[PDB]
Design a protein around this ligand. Structure first.
Ligand SMILES: [Cu+2]
Ligand code: NI
Length: 300
């Protein structure tokens, strides 16, 4: 097939799979890079270096303690033992979002992610590549120069809805009250396991819904650009609906076991008042979903 300093303030780190040999199709490899600095640094850019022939997708996470110590591992074992803050999502034939000017992820120091964990997913494998080494990964741009806007993730996950067997349509709803400084959403990622039909994200302010993003979870799960970023402010509600099918299923499915309904909202905040991670696992305002826009029920 290390560390490259660019100027006084900046430097570049590339996180590459260490010459792995995926044997078969639909296989996920995970690896880790500890952060070279112990002071706070800002990830301000990404360069993907994926072999076009065999790599379906790549995920970059930041987390305090990862799932394995070895040069690489299967991500079926896990990504991080702790919160995996997703930093980067690349998919073949997918728009990779470019962070807006002056946006950087805060890493290192007291609060910031200690490690990067790289996930590479390989979907198309020839059996006449029984011993070919791949060094797939991404290049990260770090600066110690402080950024005015800090990127972070609002993770919306449906902790319990059950899909009754054979129900053609089942709705998974998540809502939380926003009680922080203003967050500006520039991207979103939706995740689900093959019963999902559509995932839609909304800001609700004074009973008026504003769309963040709608996607089919069966498509490439990259980060989709929010064409005009949504401002989410204190006293707003974030509401999300996942649509599922119970069709063809013998038993009830759970959303530990079975299904997932996850919405990833990528945002920026003024550095002064910024926090990197927020989560919602509640549906505080269930009654409100009657008034949900009709678009949210329209499939893709
Ligand atoms: Cu999942
Ligand atoms: Ni191990």
């Amino acid at each position: 097939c290390p560390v490259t300093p660019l100027d006084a303030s900046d430097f570049a780190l590339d996180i590459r799979m260490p010459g792995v040999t995926p044997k078969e199709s639909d296989t996920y490899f995970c690896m880790s890079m500890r952060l070279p600095v112990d002071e706070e640094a800002f990830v301000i850019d990404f360069k993907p270096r994926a072999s076009m022939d065999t790599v379906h997708a790549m995920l970059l996470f930041g987390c305090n303690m990862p799932s394995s110590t070895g040069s690489y591992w299967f991500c079926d074992e896990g990504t991080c033992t702790d919160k995996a803050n997703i930093l980067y999502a690349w998919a073949r034939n997918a728009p990779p979002t470019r962070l807006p000017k002056g946006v950087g992820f805060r890493v290192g120091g007291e609060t910031g992610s200690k490690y990067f964990v790289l996930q590479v997913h390989y979907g198309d494998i020839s059996a006449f590549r029984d011993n070919h080494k791949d060094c797939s990964g991404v290049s990260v741009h770090l600066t110690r120069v402080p950024q005015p806007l800090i990127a972070g993730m609002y993770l919306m996950m449906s902790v319990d809805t059950v899909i009754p067997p054979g129900e053609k349509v089942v709705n998974a709803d998540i809502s939380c009250q926003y009680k922080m400084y203003p967050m500006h959403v520039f991207a979103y990622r939706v995740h689900t396991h093959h019963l999902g039909k559509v995932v839609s994200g909304y800001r609700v302010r004074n009973g008026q819904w504003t769309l963040i993003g709608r996607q089919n979870p069966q498509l490439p799960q990259a980060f989709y650009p929010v064409e005009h970023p949504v401002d989410v402010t204190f006293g707003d509600i974030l509401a999300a609906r996942c649509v599922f099918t119970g069709e063809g299923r013998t038993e009830a499915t759970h959303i530990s076991s079975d299904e997932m309904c996850n919405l990833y909202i990528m945002y920026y905040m003024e550095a002064k008042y910024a926090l990197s991670f927020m989560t919602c696992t509640k549906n505080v305002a269930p009654d409100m979903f009657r008034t949900i826009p009709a678009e949210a029920n329209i499939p893709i």
